Ligand binder design. Structure first.
Ligand code: A5A
Ligand code: A5A
Ligand code: ZN
Ligand code: ZN
Lengths: 904, 905
RNA sequence: GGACUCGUAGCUCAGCGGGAGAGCGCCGCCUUUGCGAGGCGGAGGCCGCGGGUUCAAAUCCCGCCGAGUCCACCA
């Protein structure tokens, strides 16, 4: 917490004219070089002053400021570094880059690995979605921003510089930028994040935290000597300089514009206004006067949300002279504009550095920013697509990205399809639930977006439409991002049985061809046999495991599976059990190990191919080879066409044909990252100061395991099945070598045994199959017509076989048929104005049917017929249906008809 | 003319020989005496040595060779071990007919030096040309070993000529037992294999034991001299040809009745003991009857006619046996001798890799199996052909490249393949006896020709069914030879318009680099020629090395690439740079590589097929079309699916082993001695130096582009396996990106078919069978329903039919297709209805007339066919046809009435 | 290498331009005293695949596929 030394160990502040004092309400001590005046810099006590009168000696641009800051610290002794990707590929804890120091943790910060240079300087772009809700409302917060920084890594006894010389330099740069030493305030505070924390002081000028100098010394650990934000941090041996400068906030104070958005990307802001439904004009002088007051005091109203927000809103509106209900004709719509302008910029870096939208993982955070951005464009009714804004952001910044704008658009265009589609099914669920619930808690909105893909802002309108009362908390959206910001530990069942053995050697790194080894054993517990010097290949992924037997003088021992725990090897044995301390020699099954090598080599080739064919946005989620199968999972927005499938398999095997060398050797992480890039961690992140580098062609990956010497040892890659497991990811199924031939052979056998039962040539199978099929449809459609015609004719043959009575053809026959026939017949007889009835000797009781196209009632007829043959039924005027217990002869059929037909 | 060369022999004159003219055959010869022979006497001589061995001691097959072989080996000759009986090294002949044929024609034309000089070898030879004699003459064989010794002489220096040749011969004769005066030397012209020359037939004991040729002639289209139809020219290269009948040498030493009884007595004994033969070999009669029959055998061969019965009576009465009885021993023996000899020939054919076929080289082997089987039937042999062949492998004691287990499986196939054919054939003949009720030659020639049924069988069956027969014995080969046609006569290649000397291509030692740097030499039409190149001319559909040919001015391109000997051809469709400015050229990389992959993979598959199946498989053909390829090998039956599978397995095992593929120019003599005759599966390349290619293990003479290693060829996939002809099998395949695209193409056809029936690609067949079964049912149910429609329709019209003499007639225009009309009428006819029906169609109206009574319907069709101008016909009950003018019921009934009026009284 | 013949019910095949049939085999009922046959009845067909001719194709022509045979420096 508080240690007197760090506060007074500074030989610069105190000895260059700096004093500090604490105010009652804030309670925090701030170093001011102006003893005459006292300010603070936090929301409850400060307002921005520099608007109109730029504190700096000159307005600067965002790209001219990078160099001015970077070139400055370049000639002080610091080395220059290039920006890291906004996605955390190098670490396992988080998805996105939180800080500039987040680039170096936990490997350089825990001293395990060296730094690229010491000291270093950088303009690292970060995405902080914790401050998401505060974006647009305060005018000083951004989702994506370049955090200028300059670090210095110091180990027990050595350092380039410490807090004194730099704050000095920090103060100097400002003095070289047109800022007098007294206008600067250093508010003392702690700063945490990424597992590393430490005491700091935040540089405040014009009432704006433009910089932040963190002096971190504590590493996160369950011991938790200190307690910070509920997290447990603990002191480490080495200490490190961690500084953070906001490029975004520096240009703002140079140009002296209302908000940070008008300072950085004015083109976008001005463009959004002109092509959205916002009423007011931004050029008009009347509006400009409003904006000046609206922006100069925006710092506090951002942290305020409720009726207390109106307590400041009411006060701020009157000074201008215009009502509170009219001020919100600008401040409320501008928020929607400022946010969309900023969020779009964040879309650039997210998608530009290889993020693919999904329902989970790092793709969720990508999707989230697009989803919300799409919503804001419907509240502004923008005539532009979201891509059109990105187009400006790219050219305004002048950055070069791994993922091209061609890829960016196809994603943004596919998402609006999915967004608008996932909305239609949602509203009915919303409008139904708001009537049962009648209220909306914090959890209801979070449940809405994650489960049903419905934005928060959309839910509030439908809530207001139907009377429900809704409670939107502060950081409502930041809660969404944070809850999906943790890269899950992918924790699987771990067994660490105490063997009291902390040592273990591995032998298959140098040469995978070496299939047999020689060493002593100490294995004692379980079914597992632990050997000090073993060349077996264990894995917790179920498979990719070597297999073999062991013979000594006592007998033979067979090992089916091989596992690993705490860096120590395990060998399962079913059969006899070896004696501890035996000089043994192990043998690997040649085929199984050879197969992994052939297959594993193929996997690294395929990943290269997918990247080369589709785009640079391809990264890998998982990999597993089943018995006679194998799979690879990559990031992609849509299911690949069969045109692309062919291109993939072509390229992968074109690499085989080249037979390129497959080198493996250990490299230093910093030396490795510098040489290739963060593509090196596609299959995971290996620890240690030195890692194992694998190269299969132009593909370079940290893949400790078995491989071939050349790409031609693989054989051929044939994709078996391609499907989409989830939005954003697609699963491939492939096989090479022996499994390639078998797969291909099986496809022949199907093609051969299918074309041979149609007596056609396999090359003509597609065209001949449709021919057989189209005929099968037509001849089926034909059959039901012939059956109709049989009834069409059987009717015509019964009108002739009918005697006439009162100018009406009455027919009465006994025919052999089923019930439907009698109905399908009588309906056609009554369509030709005929009257009478029919009977069928069906199994059981005699089925009867009557009919009449004339005015005579059919059911009435059946009643009379019924009491002669003992039975009854029902029906309508045109046809009738029934069943009796005895058949009736034709002559006795006629007289009943003639009797019935006469009376009416 | 020819006398000048026979008379030059100083040896004959110097060593007491003399040239006489025998007054019987009108030909000259030599003899070492005037008066000891007191012969020859009219017309020719018989055997004398039967009962009287000419040699000092009886020899054997093995004993004879080593004596003969050592004889020349110690006298300076070079011993080269025998060639296979199959013509592998030659494209002209099918099997080795003479010992000299092992060196024709490249060695015999001076292009290549002989293995050594001089030479000597007991070489196996097959002559199915002279079979008809074999079995009767008692001196002929289908297969025999021809011991020889050859000298090869160039202009200026020789090893030895005709004088020394005869001298070396007489010595071997005299050192063996026969006196110099018993030996006779007859002058006969000789030709064969493309090389001809004057010759001396050596006759001792009344038998031709040796023959030697002095090749001064070789075949040419413009030859001045003429022998056996073909033309020969004078050689500037003279070769000494000799040939000693090993089997005949052994025979004379044993003094046995027949050569058959000397070479393989055991084989002959096995047959006779288990046959239906009417006698016992041990009796005095048969020993005596045969001993004299064998003496007069040599005449009954070269002279066949009606006087054979007179000579038969001569030997019969001289041995005093009834003429029918002599046949009772002679005729069954001939079959036994032939079969015993045939089986011996069989052995070497399969053993050296001849796979029985219905055509080509393989048919030679089949034919021999056929004849062997026919004889076994007449003898009612209790053993299979394999048993007899098995003996020869032991008796002759030779080692073959082809295993004997393979041989039996080939015999069991060919035996069953015959018994299947004769059954199919016999049943056909019977069916003629009930249809033709007679047999004639036009049939009989066709029965044998296109069904393999021997002339005798048909007559035998016809007599078992008592059918008229005639057997044209001498009209057998005429119609088989009568009708012909050939399109072109000239040489294979288009002769070039202009010539330029000494071309060369460096791409042999450099397939790895495409581009070159050379200069222009000459230009002609669309094609051009340069100094040196890396372009490899295509043979067949593909194998083309395609490339863009730039200049100092502009860029040009080559479409196809061909070759003229001594000049590379580059086919272009466009402009042409003149000789003035020399140019450079480029080659397409992707196109080149695909062929190099196919080339190497072609060798690889052949290597696989041998290992998987057997040594009996040889490449009989190979070529490729882009995205495809083919390779033909000799195998008796289309492989089982497992065999094809493992072949594909083994092939892909070899692509991963990554065996280096070396390649180097070698001379002929050293090339074939080190490897084996597998070298000439690719072809027979003319020239002194030969480009050989070592692909992993297998080595061939390939002048085509190749790969550095078997890893560059990529995956190999057999596309299709069809049996071209029984005994020859073709394999279709592809490797590299061509294999990728072919499997991808194969995958599409399956995927596509499934997306038509909306099913899993795995269930496609079992779902198709379902649809097919239903399709057959629904097609069948429509037939039943349609019959009811007609059955119902027929009754409808009978009710409203006009009555004409108690005959109800119907004439209406109905709405139904052609098949309904026809089905309708045949129902109306069955119920005695008369008239016609019509229906609107497609630029036509179908008309059907019908009659259940005496009136003829096909006549009615024309009577209504005059009215509306429509043709057609059919049976008497119904008639089908079309018309261009529809007729109203009245118009029709006006005709029906008119027709009916014609045919009553 | 050059030709010839044949693809039709499970099998052997006839029909060879206008109704797809016979023999044997298969399912059933009838007669028998002559155990196995006889009598009567029925199911079982892309008439090899694909184009051309004709009003009409199992049928005539062309091509492919498959099953066969002879001849042969003639081919
Ligand atoms: C240096 C330390 N690792 C750190 O990250 N400090 S910080 O969290 O305060 O951020 C560093 C600098 O970036 C800027 N910054 C921080 N959060 C920001 C946000 N949500 N939007 C825009 N800029 C921000 C501030 O100017 C700040 O001084
Ligand atoms: C070698 C010479 N070019 C040549 O062909 N000579 S020849 O045709 O006359 O036959 C060579 C020798 O082999 C033997 N021979 C030839 N034809 C034979 C046959 N059909 N059966 C057995 N022996 C034969 C004869 O003894 C003959 O002298
Ligand atoms: Zn891997
Ligand atoms: Zn070759």
């Amino acid at each position: 917490m508080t240690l007197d030394e760090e506060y007074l160990d500074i030989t610069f502040l105190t000895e260059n004219g700096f004093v500090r004092k604490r105010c009652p309400k804030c309670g925090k001590h701030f170093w001011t070089a102006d003893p005459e005046r006292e300010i603070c810099g936090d929301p409850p006590c400060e307002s921005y002053s520099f608007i109109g009168n730029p504190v700096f000696k000159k307005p600067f641009e965002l790209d001219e400021m990078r160099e001015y800051y970077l070139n400055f610290f370049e000639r002080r002794g610091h080395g220059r570094i290039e920006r890291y990707p906004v996605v955390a590929r190098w670490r396992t804890d988080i998805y996105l880059t939180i800080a500039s120091i987040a680039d170096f943790q936990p490997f350089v910060t825990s001293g395990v690995a060296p730094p690229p240079a010491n000291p270093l300087t950088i303009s690292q772009p970060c995405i902080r979605l914790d401050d998401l809700d505060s974006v647009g409302r305060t005018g000083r917060h951004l989702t994506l921003f370049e955090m200028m920084a300059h670090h210095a890594f110091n180990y027990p006894g050595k350092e380039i510089y410490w807090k004194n010389e730099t704050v000095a330099y920090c103060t100097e740069l400002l003095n070289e930028l047109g800022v007098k030493k007294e206008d600067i305030v250093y508010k003392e505070e702690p700063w945490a994040g990424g597992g590393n924390a430490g005491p700091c002081l935040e540089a405040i000028v014009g009432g704006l935290e433009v910089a932040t100098l963190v002096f971190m010394n504590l590493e996160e650990h369950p011991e938790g000597d200190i307690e910070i934000k509920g997290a447990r941090y603990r002191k480490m041996d080495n200490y490190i300089v961690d500084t953070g400068y906001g490029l975004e906030r520096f240009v703002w104070a140079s140009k002296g514009t209302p908000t940070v958005y008008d300072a950085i990307f004015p083109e976008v802001v001005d463009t959004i206004i002109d092509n959205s439904n916002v009423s007011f004009n931004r050029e008009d002088e009347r509006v400009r006067r409003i904006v000046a007051e609206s922006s100069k005091l925006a710092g506090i109203m951002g942290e305020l949300r409720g009726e207390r927000l109106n307590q400041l809103r009411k006060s701020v509106a009157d000074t201008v002279g215009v009502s509170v209900e009219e001020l919100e004709g600008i401040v409320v719509p501008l928020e929607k504009v400022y946010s969309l302008a900023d969020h779009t910029r964040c879309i650039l870096f997210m998608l530009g550095d290889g993020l693919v939208p999904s329902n989970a993982g790092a793709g969720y955070l990508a999707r989230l920013m697009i989803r919300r951005s799409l919503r804001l464009a419907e509240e502004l009714e923008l005539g532009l697509d979201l891509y059109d804004l990105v187009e400006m952001h790219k050219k305004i910044l002048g950055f070069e990205f791994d993922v091209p704008l061609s890829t960016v658009q196809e994603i943004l265009e596919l998402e609006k399809e999915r967004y608008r589609t996932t909305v239609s099914k949602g509203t009915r669920l919303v409008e139904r639930l708001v009537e049962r619930k009648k209220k909306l808690e914090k959890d209801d909105l979070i449940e809405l977006y994650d489960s049903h893909g419905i934005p928060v802002e959309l839910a509030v309108g439908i809530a207001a439409e139907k009377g429900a009362e809704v409670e939107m908390p502060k950081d409502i959206y930041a809660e969404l991002a944070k809850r999906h910001s943790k890269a899950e530990k992918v924790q699987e069942k771990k067994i660490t049985l105490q063997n009291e053995y902390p040592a273990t050697e591995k032998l298959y790194y140098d040469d995978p061809t070496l299939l047999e080894f020689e060493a002593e054993v100490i294995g004692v517990e379980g079914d597992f046999v632990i050997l000090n010097r073993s060349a077996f290949y264990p894995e917790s992924g179920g498979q990719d495991n070597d297999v073999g037997y062991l013979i000594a003088n006592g007998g033979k021992f067979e090992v089916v599976d091989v596992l690993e725990a705490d860096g120590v090897v395990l060998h399962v044995v079913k059969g006899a059990k070896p004696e501890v301390g035996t000089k043994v020699k192990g043998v690997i099954d040649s085929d199984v190990r050879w197969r992994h090598m052939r297959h594993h080599s193929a996997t690294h080739v395929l990943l290269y191919s997918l990247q080369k064919v589709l785009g640079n946005h391809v990264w890998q989620a998982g990999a597993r080879k089943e018995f006679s199968k194998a799979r690879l999972d990559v990031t992609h927005f849509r299911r690949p066409s069969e045109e692309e499938i062919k291109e993939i398999e072509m390229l992968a095997n074109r690499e085989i044909l080249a037979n390129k060398p497959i080198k493996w050797e250990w490299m230093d992480r910093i030396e490795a990252e510098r040489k290739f890039g963060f593509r090196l961690y596609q299959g995971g992140v290996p620890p240690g100061r030195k890692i194992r580098v694998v190269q299969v062609g132009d593909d370079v990956q940290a893949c400790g395991g078995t491989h071939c010497r050349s790409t031609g040892e693989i054989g051929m890659l044939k994709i078996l099945k391609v499907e989409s497991i989830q939005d954003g990811v697609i699963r491939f199924e492939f096989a090479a070598g022996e499994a390639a031939i078998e797969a291909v052979e099986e496809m022949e056998r199907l093609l051969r045994e299918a074309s041979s039962i149609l007596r056609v040539e396999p090359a003509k199978l597609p065209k001949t199959v449709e021919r057989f099929f189209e005929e099968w449809k037509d001849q089926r459609k034909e059959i039901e017509r012939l059956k109709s015609v049989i009834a069409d004719l059987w009717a015509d043959i019964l009108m002739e076989r009918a005697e006439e009575f009162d100018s009406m053809k009455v027919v009465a026959e006994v025919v052999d048929a089923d019930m439907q026939a009698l109905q399908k017949l009588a309906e056609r007889l009554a369509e030709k104005g005929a009257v009478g009835c029919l009977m069928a000797k069906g199994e059981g009781k005699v089925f009867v049917v009557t009919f009449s196209g004339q005015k005579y009632d059919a059911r009435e007829l059946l009643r009379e017929i019924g009491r002669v043959a003992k039975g009854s039924g029902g029906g309508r005027k045109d046809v009738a249906q029934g069943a009796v217990q005895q058949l009736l002869d034709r002559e006795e059929m006629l007289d009943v008809i003639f009797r019935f037909l006469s009376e009416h």
